[PDB]
């Protein structure tokens, strides 16, 4: 109804750009690595004993991550209200403040919101490093010293390639290039026909909504490129050399290698899905605005 009911498409990363916080569970891509190590530990009797204490260590981080995101629901719904006013000309006319005033209110609340998602999760990011090191110590309890069989490592690679086939990368790449093409043409025609004689509310709402689209497109292509990397890297491992036995030190980083890739994949699959419907909902809002703009021709 020319309004946005879901603003899950915002995200924030730390100043080091190492951790990416998503509004969708599990919020962190590292949690997927923690859930995958439980599957890694399922094939090792020495590590499988500590799997019970691992869930309490991982679920607590997932609970505190889900708790910190919920604290920002006050900042979230505040921005959602300013978006619904700036993208809806009819709603913008029920209030009395100038359009430039509401844009300044939107920019202040938007960063206050994205700052909340990062600030309330700073304690969780430090816990990610600890659980990563705790996984390293659990993998040291393996019975192998210098001849660790890579069957478990390569059996997980075969599973990852099957999971990769479930995601439509070709359709996603076709979708993003096609919608990014329509988005660029929309911005460029507004440059051609813009004028400051009549009421610019319908034109201002288009550019405001288009600014949201360009952000969603940039975030969609980030995950689409990141997911492509994880698919191509794991596939390169299966098509590359297969050492029948490696040491334990290299086996720890072996699971860490495929674990990080599959984590980015499942994390990107969650984001690419949400970012796809947000771009679709944003296109319908713009076309309704375009329909409302070209609806009063005798004026």
């Amino acid at each position, epitope marked *: 109804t020319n309004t946005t009911d879901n603003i899950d498409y915002f995200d924030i990363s730390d100043e080091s750009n190492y951790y990416l916080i998503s509004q969708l569970r599990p919020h962190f891509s590292n949690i997927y690595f923690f859930d995958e190590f439980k599957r890694y530990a399922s094939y090792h009797t020495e590590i499988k004993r500590y799997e019970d204490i691992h869930k309490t260590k991982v679920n607590s981080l997932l609970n505190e991550a889900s708790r910190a995101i919920g604290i920002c629901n006050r900042a979230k719904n505040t921005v959602k209200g300013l978006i619904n006013i700036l993208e809806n000309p009819q709603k913008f006319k029920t209030q009395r403040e100038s359009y430039d005033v509401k844009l300044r209110q939107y920019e202040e609340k938007k960063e206050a919101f994205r700052g909340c998602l990062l600030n309330k999760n700073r304690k969780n990011l430090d816990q990610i490093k600890k659980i990563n090191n705790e996984i390293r110590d659990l993998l040291e309890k393996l019975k192998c010293s210098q001849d660790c069989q890579t069957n478990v490592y390569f059996d997980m690679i075969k599973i990852y390639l099957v999971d990769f086939k479930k995601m439509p990368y070709e359709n996603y790449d076709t979708f993003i290039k096609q919608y*990014k093409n329509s988005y660029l043409s929309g911005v460029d025609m507004i440059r051609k026909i813009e004028k400051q004689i009549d009421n610019p509310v319908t034109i201002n709402a288009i550019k405001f909504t288009q600014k949201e689209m360009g*952000y969603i497109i940039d*975030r969609f*292509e980030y995950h689409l490129q*990141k997911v492509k990397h994880s698919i191509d890297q794991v596939t390169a491992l299966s098509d590359g050399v297969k050492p029948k036995q490696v040491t334990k030190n290299r086996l720890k980083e072996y699971y860490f290698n495929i674990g990080n890739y599959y984590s980015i994949f499942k994390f990107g699959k969650d984001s690419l899905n949400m970012l796809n419907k947000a771009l679709i909902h944003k296109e319908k809002i713009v076309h309704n605005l375009l329909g409302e703009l070209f609806g009063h021709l005798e004026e």
Partner: antibody
Amino acid sequence: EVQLLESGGGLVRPGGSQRLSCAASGFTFTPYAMTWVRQAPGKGLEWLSTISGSGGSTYYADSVKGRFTISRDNSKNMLYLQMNSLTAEDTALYYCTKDKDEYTFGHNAFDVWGQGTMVTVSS
Amino acid sequence: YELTQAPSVSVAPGQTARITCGGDNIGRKTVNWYQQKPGQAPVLVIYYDNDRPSGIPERFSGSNSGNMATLSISRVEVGDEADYYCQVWDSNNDHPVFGGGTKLTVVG
């Protein structure tokens, strides 16, 4: 004041490699799409490569495709151009730019320009 | 997309200089103009056919319709002597493209 600063340009033998950098300051570097554009001494401007904000989109000119790679670090406001297998026809002065708006992917004007670093390829 | 620009255009001071930029249907796409002084960096002078960045004198105007996009400099002084380019977005190649450039020389 938004400013773009470039370096790394120098003399390189044909077939060698060179890494150009574009230092940004005075503006939010992440949302804007940065661009590389070179200009041969005497000749006109020539677009080379533009990159999206998040880095998920990278464009390249046919003259530099397969040899040049564009990249950015959104935590240091830096912007790179890795040049490989340089030929004599690559000797030019290289500019880096930014779209005047955000989330545009090179479909904009280029309001801020660097001073340009000089790449020379000869035996 | 090919952008044809005249190599050189001259003008006396006080007069109005007209830099041109041709295209098959250049009135369909926005045109941005730039100014590069000798041994200097390009400066955006006009964008989106007729928009003018802040700080650019009012003497710099632009037109774009059909097959011709023209940049106009009025009350020309010796400080306008520079090179002027036009930038367009390639539709089917998906990248910007610059014109050959027009060298404005002030005479008189």
